[model samples]
Target: MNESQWIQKHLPCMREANPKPRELIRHALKKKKRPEVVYAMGVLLTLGGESGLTVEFPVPEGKTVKVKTLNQLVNGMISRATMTLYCVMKDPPSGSMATLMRDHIRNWLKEESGCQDADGGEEKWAMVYGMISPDMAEEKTMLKELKTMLHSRMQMYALGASSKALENLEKAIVAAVHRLPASCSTEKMVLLGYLK
Candidate 1:
């Protein structure tokens, strides 16, 4: 079923019944469903629905649930909740699209620095240094990365980044401003004074 449908199905239970932890654990044990149980418990706790409720899963003798398995279960629930909230709340660009934009920016920076491989070599490191400095060359490099980030953010949106592409782009710009040292007035002013 689609995310909304799944949410619609469970939301009533989530909202109306602040099931105790022991009750939830019992349901999970009886239903042979552990993940959703943990997730539901987490959600309840998050929403202040679990006040004075403490539940712990007990692995019966000769039965074991791996850490990864538990993580998958909990994360799946969180993903569902996030998706439902995104749809209901109309939050744009979605986490997936924002990640894509971030990756794109990092990749673009790599290309600009001519550093191949995942490690981002000394050359790329120097480029980063330059980009954050007030030196002409560094400023130029920084500007290039900034422009590329903006252009790519726009391009990704056109390629269907998501409903919240512009919002994501704005977020990316804010992130970039913090990341790029050349954009810092204090740093630039200090460097400019040093140049004199």
Candidate 2:
């Protein structure tokens, strides 16, 4: 199902279901689906639902869920260097709340559940998902492997590179590879090509 169908069907339970936000992650992904979509849903739920999308990203000592909202999660990702990368992503959300997030926290801002009701909620949801780091190590490792596959060991991999950079790289590589000889002649290239 698409994001809207998924969100519309499942979000109501979140509105009145459990009291703890972390539990929502597993509850929503109960089907154990594929990586990307599962991760996306998990990302939104973790951010504390469309109720202004608060999160327990790291419940600091001596604070209630009061202190750990979506605002801090973004700053925590960047300020703590806990995340290697984040962006609105291809077809992700962009709006007032999304922009205001880049500024600072208001400590209270009407709890609008902004994305859920927006015309572009799904887009905004995807953008918000990209903003948060659901899992770091695995994604970072994937990032490293992908950069190495850029066909140039000489190029310094920029971990903080742009989304478009990766997009274009993927495009050129796939396009170029599609027209190549069906099978490469690698029988002795490793031994011969690197001979000193």
Candidate 3:
């Protein structure tokens, strides 16, 4: 497989293994850190008790990692990983829902700490962080509220789409066609004709 193909294949497994952004965000002040390290630590903690867990970091030929030092290793690497909104949204969010919900989360985060990302492709699946404190209880509460709102809105859209007659939907279809970027008139007419 090519590079993109390899990434696509591994993305789902990696996603399943990674921690949720909410889990990491809530535990920001704790020793439990970045999603990747948190996930690895969880597995290690479960696999081995307080005594020791044998794991190699480098996985090279010579060096061996100390069995009991895993947690400390996790701590050291916490800030090394910057959490992204991609970690949260990569799991779900269909074509339409992703962009709509992405803006909602981004806006709410703006109200909290304000965010900026170098890459805005696929609409700002960027690293999210700020000067967080224990007093951020309200922000956390609002995130929970946003989660509820997102799900409710998703259900509404899905059911509403299913129930809408094609005749009623055609107006939306036409509007979408009209909004298409730099679409030529010939192709636009063809698109509408094909839809008809």
Candidate 4:
């Protein structure tokens, strides 16, 4: 498929996997049994390599990756893998929620850290670094600042700050869009449109 077709096919899956703020709030409430205040924090961590908003890595040498690689990986395969993990974890009889969650998170991190060529050169995969545009850099800074503010607010309510943790977490949802070689606002709007 062409690039646009490929992006279209995967967009919805990425949206679903990413889970918007409202959906996240709903899910958090469900998990906490607090239907009144469904405000759960979603953290997106990258493993294997660092890129985009990754604050931590699963392995020691897993370098931070570029926003582009993170986006490409998720749009291409990580979203599907995450969906599968979510399904299995949600199974009524599965006692593997912890394992499944860990695996899912690990998979996402690993996927972001490395790249695969059409000719299959996985071993040579490298981390992406310092390639974000000025606009994207601004967006990232804004997200971090917002997350910190949200965290402090939530903490005041005695709820702590998963959303703070989620600053990087949510970044994954749009990592692909942010990786686009256009202005940050435009990329954000494109991803938001998918949600609509």
> On residues 1-196, what C-alpha lDDT tens digit does candidate 3 reach at each position?
1212222232322222224333322342253333443333222222222112222121223323232232333343344321222222222333444444334333332332212212222111111111112225265343333334333434445566444453344445446555645634664665454343
Which has the higher lDDT value, candidate number 1 or candidate number 2?
1
- Estimate TM-scores for all models: 0.22, 0.20, 0.17, 0.17
Model 3 — which ten-residue stretch has the worst lDDT? 122-131
Best by lDDT: 1
Higher lDDT: candidate 1 or 4?
1
Residue 41 displacement in candidate 4 (angstroms): 11
lDDT (0-100) at residue 31 of candidate 3? 37
lDDT of each residue in 127-193, candidate 1, tens digit only: 4334433545444466456656655655665687765765676566556556656446775454333
Tens digits of per-residue lDDT for model 4, 126-195: 1111123323556635544433433343343355446556455345434544555554576467444532
Summed over model 1, clashes come to: 2
**Model-by-model lDDT, in order?**
0.39, 0.34, 0.33, 0.31
Give me the candidate number with maximum TM-score. 1
Q: How do the candidates rank by lDDT, highest first?
A: 1, 2, 3, 4
Which residue runs does candidate 1 get wrong by more than 4 Å? 1-140, 182-196
Off-target runs (Cα >4 Å) in candidate 4 are 1-83, 92-97, 110-196
The full ranking of all candidates by TM-score, starting with the best, is 1, 2, 4, 3
Model 3 spans > 4 angstroms off: 1-91, 112-196
